[PDB]
Design a protein around this ligand. Structure first.
Ligand SMILES: CC(=O)N[C@@H]1[C@@H](O)[C@H](O[C@@H]2O[C@H](CO)[C@@H](O)[C@H](O)[C@H]2NC(C)=O)[C@@H](CO)O[C@H]1O
Ligand code: NGO
Length: 497
C-alpha cells in the first residue's frame, strides 16, 4: 500500500522569526529543534507558513521579515530531511488572516490570478521563492476564491504545475518531484464557491488538504463539535449550500446529491468531494486539528453540547477576560476561545474542574466544566483512531493538521497518526465506526454499481421504472415513458453497470 501522507503545519509569527531562538520558550514556544528525528520520520510533509502575495502580485514574505533569520529557520527545517528521505518542506501562501474576503491582502490574491500575464508573473514568483529558500513544494491557502475568480485560480494552478514539473526535470527530482497542494474548504458554505469546478482545481494538485475543522465556533449560536467525523441527530444541522452552486443540474440531481439540512461533518466534506467526477480519493487529504475551541456560558443537560452560550465570536477577542480556567497559553495569547491539545492535556490532568466526555456518534471527545459552564470541542489520539481508519477505508491520500506546535511535548498526536497508518503491531480491524449519521448524497462521481433488467424498446414504462441501458441503470421520474434512457429528461441516471 502506498504510504499515507502526514502533513503538518509549522507556523511561526513574523516576530518569532525575527527573534528566533531555540533556547527560550517564552520567545519561541516551538522552535524547529522540537521536531526530533523521530517526529521528522513520522511526517511526510511540513507546511511552512505563512507567506503572502504582495501588492506587486507576487509570492513574498511578510515585508517586516528579517530575511537572514527566515532563511535560517527554513534551513533548520530542510536539514530534517537528513532523517527522512521522503520528507518535503512545503511553504504555504495565504491562510485566513491574509486572504479571507476581509483580510489585509485579499485584493492581491484576486488580482494575481486575473490575467495570463499576472498569472505567469505570480506562478514564476512561487517557483523562484521555492528554489531560493530551498522549499520542496508550493501550497496555496486562499480562503477562498469566489465563483468569478475560480477560472483564474485554476489557470494559476495549471501554470505553477507546468513550471514545477519543469523544475523537477531540471533538478533531477524524479524520485521526489516538486509538489503542489492547496488547503481546501472542509465545509459546504465555503466549498460552494468553487465546487462546480472541483475537477479542474484538483487536476494540477498532488493533494487537496481539506480544512475539516473549525466546523463549529463562537460565531455560531449553539455549541457543537468543530470536527465531528459523523453526525449526531441531537446536534445542529445546516443548510446544504452546495445545492445552490452553479452546476446546471436538475432538481432531482441536486436534491439527491445535496440533502438539506445536513450534518456539517468531516465525512460530509470528504463525501461531497468524492461525489464529483474527476476527483480521485487518493488526492483527498483529511485535515485534523491539534487544538480545541472553547465556549463559556453553556447550560447543562448534554455535557455542554448543543447549548446556547455567551462567547464573543469576533476577531480579535473583544475582551480581556481570560475565562478558560487553567489555560495559561490562553493568557499569553490573550484568547480563551482556542487551546492547543498540549494545553488541554495539562488542564485535564490538573484538577481544574473539567470532565472529559465522549460522543460515540461523532467519535470525538469534549470537555465540560460544570462549575463554570464551559464546553470545549477538541480532538485526541482516540478520535484519531476513527479518522485514521476512515482515511484507510475511503482510500484517501492521508492526513493534514494544524499545527505542530500544538501537539504535546512528546508529539503523541503525530505519533498516533503515524502508528494508525504504519505500525505493524497496531490492529484496528475490530474498531467500530459506529452509527453516527453518514452523508447520504449521491452524485456523478460516486454512482453505485447496480443491476436491473435491460431496457426493452417498445415497452411503456411507469413511474420509477428501473432498466439497465448503455452501461448505466436509469430510473423514470414519471410514467408513460416509452423513450430510450438517456435522451429524455424523464430518465434519471442512478447507477453504474
Ligand atoms: C463552516 C463555516 O463556513 N464556518 C465559518 C467560519 O469558518 C468563520 O469563522 C472564521 O473561521 C476562520 C477559519 O476558517 C478563523 O480563522 C476565524 O477566526 C473565524 N472567525 C472569524 C473570522 O470571525 C465564520 C466567520 O466568517 O463564518 C462561518 O460561517
Ligand atoms: C493552512 C491553514 N490555514 C488556515 C487553516 O489551516 O486552519 C488554521 C486553524 O484555524 C488557520 O489558522 C489557518 O488560517
Amino acid at each position: 500500500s502506498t504510504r499515507k501522507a502526514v502533513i503538518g503545519y509549522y507556523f511561526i509569527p513574523t516576530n518569532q522569526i525575527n527573534n528566533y531562538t531555540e533556547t527560550d520558550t517564552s520567545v519561541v514556544p516551538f522552535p524547529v529543534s522540537n521536531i526530533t528525528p523521530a517526529k521528522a520520520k513520522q511526517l511526510t510533509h511540513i507546511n511552512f507558513s505563512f507567506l503572502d502575495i504582495n501588492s506587486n502580485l507576487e509570492c513574498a514574505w511578510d515585508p517586516a521579515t528579517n530575511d537572514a533569520k527566515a532563511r535560517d529557520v527554513v534551513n533548520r527545517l530542510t536539514a530534517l530531511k537528513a532523517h527522512n528521505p521522503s520528507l518535503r518542506i512545503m511553504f504555504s501562501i495565504g491562510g485566513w488572516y491574509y486572504s479571507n474576503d476581509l483580510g489585509v491582502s485579499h485584493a492581491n490574491y484576486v488580482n494575481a490570478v486575473k490575467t495570463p500575464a499576472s498569472r505567469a508573473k505570480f506562478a514564476q514568483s512561487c517557483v523562484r521563492i521555492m528554489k531560493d529558500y530551498g522549499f520542496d513544494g508550493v501550497d496555496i491557502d486562499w480562503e477562498y476564491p469566489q465563483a468569478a475568480e475560480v477560472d483564474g485560480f485554476i489557470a494559476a494552478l495549471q501554470e505553477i504545475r507546468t513550471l514545477l514539473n519543469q523544475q523537477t526535470i531540471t533538478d533531477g527530482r524524479q524520485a521526489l518531484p516538486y509538489q503542489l497542494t492547496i488547503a481546501g474548504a472542509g465545509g459546504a458554505f465555503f466549498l460552494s464557491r468553487y465546487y462546480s469546478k472541483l475537477a479542474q482545481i484538483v487536476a494540477p494538485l498532488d493533494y487537496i488538504n481539506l480544512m475539516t475543522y473549525d466546523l463549529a465556533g463562537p460565531w455560531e449560536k449553539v455549541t457543537n463539535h468543530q470536527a465531528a467525523l459523523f453526525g449526531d441527530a441531537a446536534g445542529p444541522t445546516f443548510y446544504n449550500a452546495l445545492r445552490e452552486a452553479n452546476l446546471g443540474w436538475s432538481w432531482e440531481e441536486l436534491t439527491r446529491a445535496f440533502p438539506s439540512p445536513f450534518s456539517l461533518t468531516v465525512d460530509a466534506a470528504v463525501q461531497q468531494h468524492l461525489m464529483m467526477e474527476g476527483v480521485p480519493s487518493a488526492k483527498i487529504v483529511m485535515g485534523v486539528p491539534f487544538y480545541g475551541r472553547a465556549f463559556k456560558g453553556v447550560s447543562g443537560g448534554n455535557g455542554g453540547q448543543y447549548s446556547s452560550h455567551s462567547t464573543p465570536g469576533e476577531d480579535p477577542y473583544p475582551s480581556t477576560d481570560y475565562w478558560l480556567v487553567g489555560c495559561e497559553e490562553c493568557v499569553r495569547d490573550k484568547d480563551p476561545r482556542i487551546a492547543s491539545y498540549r494545553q488541554l492535556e495539562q488542564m485535564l490532568q490538573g484538577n481544574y474542574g473539567y470532565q472529559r466526555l465522549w460522543n460515540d456518534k461523532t467519535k470525538t471527545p469534549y470537555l465540560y466544566h460544570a462549575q463554570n459552564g464551559l464546553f470545549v470541542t477538541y480532538d485526541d489520539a482516540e478520535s484519531f483512531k476513527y479518522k485514521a481508519k476512515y482515511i484507510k477505508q475511503q482510500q484517501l491520500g492521508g492526513v493534514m493538521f494544524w499545527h505542530l506546535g500544538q501537539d504535546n511535548r512528546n508529539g503523541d498526536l503525530l505519533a498516533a497518526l503515524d502508528r494508525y497508518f504504519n505500525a505493524a503491531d497496531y490492529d484496528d480491524s475490530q474498531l467500530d465506526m459506529g452509527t453516527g449519521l453518514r452523508y447520504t448524497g449521491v452524485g456523478p462521481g460516486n454512482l453505485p454499481i447496480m443491476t436491473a433488467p435491460a431496457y426493452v424498446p417498445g415497452t411503456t414504462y411507469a413511474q420509477g421504472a428501473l432498466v439497465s441501458y448503455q452501461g448505466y441503470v436509469w430510473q423514470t421520474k414519471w410514467g408513460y415513458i416509452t423513450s430510450a434512457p438517456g435522451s429524455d429528461s424523464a430518465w434519471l441516471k442512478v447507477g453504474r453497470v
